[PDB]
Design an enzyme around this catalytic site. Structure first.
Site, short mmCIF file in Angstrom:
data_model
loop_
_atom_site.label_atom_id
_atom_site.label_comp_id
_atom_site.label_asym_id
_atom_site.label_seq_id
_atom_site.Cartn_x
_atom_site.Cartn_y
_atom_site.Cartn_z
N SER A 144 80.08 72.83 -6.80
CA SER A 144 79.79 71.89 -6.97
C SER A 144 79.02 72.06 -8.26
CB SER A 144 78.02 71.15 -6.01
OG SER A 144 77.03 70.55 -6.13
N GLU A 156 66.46 76.28 -7.87
CA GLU A 156 67.57 76.19 -6.41
C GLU A 156 68.45 76.90 -6.60
OE1 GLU A 156 68.01 71.59 -5.28
OE2 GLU A 156 69.63 72.79 -3.67
N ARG A 181 71.39 63.25 -3.17
CA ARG A 181 70.17 63.06 -4.53
C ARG A 181 70.47 62.77 -5.33
NH1 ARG A 181 67.99 68.96 -4.44
NH2 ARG A 181 70.58 69.71 -4.50
N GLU A 186 75.39 65.35 -10.07
CA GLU A 186 76.56 66.49 -8.94
C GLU A 186 77.90 65.64 -9.61
OE1 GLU A 186 74.49 65.02 -5.71
OE2 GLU A 186 74.59 67.75 -5.32
#
EC number: 2.4.2.31
Length: 223
Positions: A144, A156, A181, A186
């Protein structure tokens, strides 16, 4: 610290020449993955719920179905860690790869969402990666990334003791609209993208550039 390389042990199937064959056997294969992977079954069910909520919004490429939309959403969830691991360590223990259909649907989803654009993205890691200073780099597993450097350096994903990857991808697909999200901005990158221009900067930054598609080690393995 982990060494960057060409990921020789990764399951990297592009399904060249067997798409039709896979689209017909994948449903049975997915059911089998679920029977060998309870976590994946739960993850899929959660992603199907999310996919159904967001799909009425826009339209999709010809051939794009619920398996594709659901697979993408699922990758943006918690199953990504185990899936990425399973793919990365495939050659080491192929008997434990319980993502046969999942890998296909996610790969097919990305391929169907392919146009010719490239993206400027970032990926932060808690683990420090080292580039040997020469040669191309490939991850093998899907990876990702975010259009946002802030997202990539968020607690994170990143630590000063880790690495920040600054990437130019040309096979990656923007999946904000196929995610749990959207705010993560992304961009999903296939494991078969190879970076031919790699550079170490400072002590925790690595630049990946001159991306190119490269024929995979595995092809139509479960077809």
């Amino acid at each position: 610290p982990l060494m960057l390389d060409t990921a020789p042990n990764a399951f990297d199937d592009q399904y060249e020449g067997c798409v039709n064959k896979m689209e017909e056997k994948a449903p049975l294969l997915l059911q089998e993955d679920f029977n060998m992977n309870a976590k994946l079954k739960v993850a899929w069910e959660e992603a199907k719920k999310r996919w159904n909520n967001i799909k009425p919004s826009r339209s999709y490429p010809k051939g794009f179905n619920d398996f594709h939309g659901t697979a993408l959403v699922a990758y943006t969830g918690s199953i990504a860690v185990d899936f990425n691991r399973a793919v990365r360590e495939f050659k080491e223990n192929p008997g434990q790869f319980h993502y046969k259909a999942f890998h296909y649907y996610l790969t097919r989803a990305l391929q169907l969402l392919s146009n010719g654009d490239c993206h400027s993205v970032y990926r932060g890691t808690k683990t420090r990666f080292h580039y040997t200073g020469a040669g191309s780099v490939r991850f093998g597993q899907f990876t990702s990334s975010s259009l946002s450097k802030k997202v990539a350096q968020s607690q994170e994903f990143f630590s000063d003791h880790g690495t920040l990857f600054i990437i130019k991808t040309c096979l990656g697909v923007y999946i904000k609209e196929f995610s749990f999200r959207p705010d993560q901005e992304e961009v999903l990158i296939p494991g078969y993208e190879v970076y031919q221009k790699v550079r170490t900067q400072g002590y925790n930054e690595i630049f990946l550039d001159s991306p190119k598609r490269k024929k995979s080690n595995y092809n139509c393995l479960y077809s």
